From Swiss-Prot, chain A:
Forms a dodecamer and interacts with nsp14 and nsp16; these interactions enhance nsp14 and nsp16 enzymatic activities. Zn(2+) 8 binds at residues 101, 104, 112, 114. The chain holds residues 4270 to 4385 of 4405 of the full protein. This is Non-structural protein 10. It is found in: Host cytoplasm, Host perinuclear region; Host cytoplasm; Host endoplasmic reticulum. Plays a pivotal role in viral transcription by stimulating both nsp14 3'-5' exoribonuclease and nsp16 2'-O-methyltransferase activities. Therefore plays an essential role in viral mRNAs cap methylation. Zn(2+) 7 binds at residues 58, 61, 67, 74. It comes from Severe acute respiratory syndrome coronavirus 2 (2019-nCoV). Residues 1-116 form the ExoN/MTase coactivator domain.
Curated annotation (Swiss-Prot), chain B:
It comes from Severe acute respiratory syndrome coronavirus 2 (2019-nCoV). This is 2'-O-methyltransferase nsp16. LRR repeats lie at residues 18-42. The chain holds residues 6800 to 7095 of 7096 of the full protein. It catalyses: a 5'-end (N(7)-methyl 5'-triphosphoguanosine)-ribonucleoside in mRNA + S-adenosyl-L-methionine = a 5'-end (N(7)-methyl 5'-triphosphoguanosine)-(2'-O-methyl-ribonucleoside) in mRNA + S-adenosyl-L-homocysteine + H(+). Changing residue 129 to A: Complete loss of virus replication in human respiratory cells. Interacts with nsp10. Signal peptide: none annotated. Residues 1-295 form the Nidovirus-type SAM-dependent 2'-O-MTase domain. The gene is rep. The active site is at 45, 129, 169, 202. It comes from the Viruses. Methyltransferase that mediates mRNA cap 2'-O-ribose methylation to the 5'-cap structure of viral mRNAs. N7-methyl guanosine cap is a prerequisite for binding of nsp16. Therefore, it plays an essential role in cap methylation of viral mRNAs, which is essential to evade the immune system, especially when restricted by human IFIT1 and IFIT3. May disrupt host mRNA splicing in nucleus by interacting with pre-mRNA Recognition Domains of the U1 and U2 snRNAs.
Length: 116, 296
């Protein structure tokens, strides 16, 4: 039995249909002079980013469903996630749809310069 | 003007009065502060609380232990915990709890009434936002409340390390005489009103550097009457100014010493080090917590 609820895909399709994104993500006060990296131990937003509490931007945390990997582990909870200011109306959507460059720590396509 | 502070602490002369309890009637009752774009009241509020705590002699040991009661919101997240985790040194053990379910950035979360929470270890800092809205009944006498306050007084006495500190939310009607009396068991205490919520009778009762014994005798009925009198005669201008300068926000890593000492072995020299925010007295074992579960 290969049945596995696919919440990531259900949320993306909910957004595409024109559904209002998950709200009440926890936005932090910070200097906005930070390194700009994607997921950090304290708020780290730069001039064009907002910083949020990790758990509140995790689809799995927010929906009370399991995390998709063998260990139950969440890489957002207990950290802070930097969201481009133009995408901060949907931090959950953003963290789902994007990937963190494993060498510079930035969002691929939103600060990562390693492929120039 | 205090509009550039994070908030206003109760002046010492108001603590020394013997007022009788009146109804709280705030001048700025109707007003609201304009928060920075997209910032929640609970984030602004805890930020200002932490900015004020930055001015006290908090003990900040390595492997600091912080527990936060009343941390859930009606929207299922923990904004106050997120600020505490931002404020506390990286690696600080932060435990979370609330009656209702929520997701949290804390190292561990316990769901249920706080009276079901037990911990083996002692703590360096206790934060409480617990509040029952059913206490704002304007039509009966405002007496000392128990509920969760009874747990909190016991928890401080049994599980707060000497030298540790406390910040417990109160309001006009949500308060407790023994908790005020316990403030006299610290080297110093105040009632702190955040500038962003200064239109509310809420305050945080802050005990700074626990001493385990009475330093002052405090009548908690008189002291809450004094607190209301201060609030009634001292309109506080709503302000979010301090929210815009976060450059010095993180709690200063003081490396405060931790010792395991026994009740007959606490000098006036020790008491004095406790009073200065230079000593934490507790065991340094592993942190173990549990929630009691009633089965049918
Ligand atoms: N004994 C206890 N044990 C463990 N947790 C406890 C205990 N008592 C309270 N809490 C927790 O404290 C948190 C903050 S108070 C939330 C609140 C504020 C206001 C306000 O501000 O007016 C109003 C309401 N309201 C309720 C219904 N219509 C409005 C609720 C909260 O998540 C609650 O579950
Ligand atoms: Zn998660
Ligand atoms: Zn890169």
């Amino acid at each position: 039995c290969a049945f596995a609820v696919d919440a990531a895909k259900a949320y993306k399709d909910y957004l595409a249909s024109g559904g209002q994104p998950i709200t009440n993500c926890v936005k932090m006060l910070c200097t906005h002079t930070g390194t700009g990296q994607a997921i950090t131990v304290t708020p780290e937003a730069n001039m064009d980013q907002e910083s949020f509490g990790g758990a509140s931007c995790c689809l799995y945390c927010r929906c009370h469903i399991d995390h998709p990997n063998p260990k139950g582990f969440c890489d957002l909870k207990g950290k802070y996630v930097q969201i481009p200011t133009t995408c901060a109306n949907d931090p959950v959507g953003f963290t789902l749809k994007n990937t963190v460059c494993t060498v510079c720590g930035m969002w691929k396509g939103y600060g990562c310069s390693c492929d120039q | 003007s205090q509009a550039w502070q994070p908030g206003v602490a109760m002046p010492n002369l108001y603590k020394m009065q013997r007022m009788l309890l009146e109804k709280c009637d705030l001048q700025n009752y109707g007003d609201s502060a304009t928060l920075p774009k997209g910032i929640m009241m609970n984030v602004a509020k805890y930020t200002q609380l932490c900015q004020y705590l930055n001015t006290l002699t908090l003990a900040v040991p390595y492997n600091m232990r912080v527990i936060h009661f009343g941390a859930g919101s009606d929207k299922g997240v923990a904004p106050g915990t997120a600020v505490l985790r931002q404020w506390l040194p990286t690696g600080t053990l932060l435990v979370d709890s609330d009656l209702n379910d929520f997701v949290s950035d804390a190292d561990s979360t316990l769901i249920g009434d706080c009276a079901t929470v037990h911990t083996a270890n002692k703590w360096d800092l206790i934060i409480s936002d617990m509040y029952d809205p059913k206490t704002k009944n304007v039509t009966k006498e405002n007496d000392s409340k128990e509920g969760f306050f009874t747990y909190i007084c016991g928890f401080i006495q049994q599980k707060l390390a000497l030298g540790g500190s406390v910040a417990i939310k109160i309001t006009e009607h949500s308060w407790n005489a023994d908790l005020y009396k316990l403030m006299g068991h610290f080297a110093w205490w105040t009632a702190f009103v955040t500038n962003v919520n200064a239109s509310s009778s809420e305050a945080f009762l802050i005990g700074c550097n626990y001493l385990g014994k009475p330093r002052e005798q405090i009548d908690g009925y008189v002291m809450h009457a004094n607190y209301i009198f201060w609030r009634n005669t001292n309109p506080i201008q709503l302000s979010s100014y301090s929210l815009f300068d976060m450059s010095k926000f993180p709690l200063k890593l003081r490396g405060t010493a931790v010792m395991s000492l026994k009740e007959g072995q606490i000098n006036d020299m020790i008491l004095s080090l406790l009073s200065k925010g230079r000593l934490i007295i507790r065991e340094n074992n592993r942190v173990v917590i549990s929630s009691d579960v009633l089965v049918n």
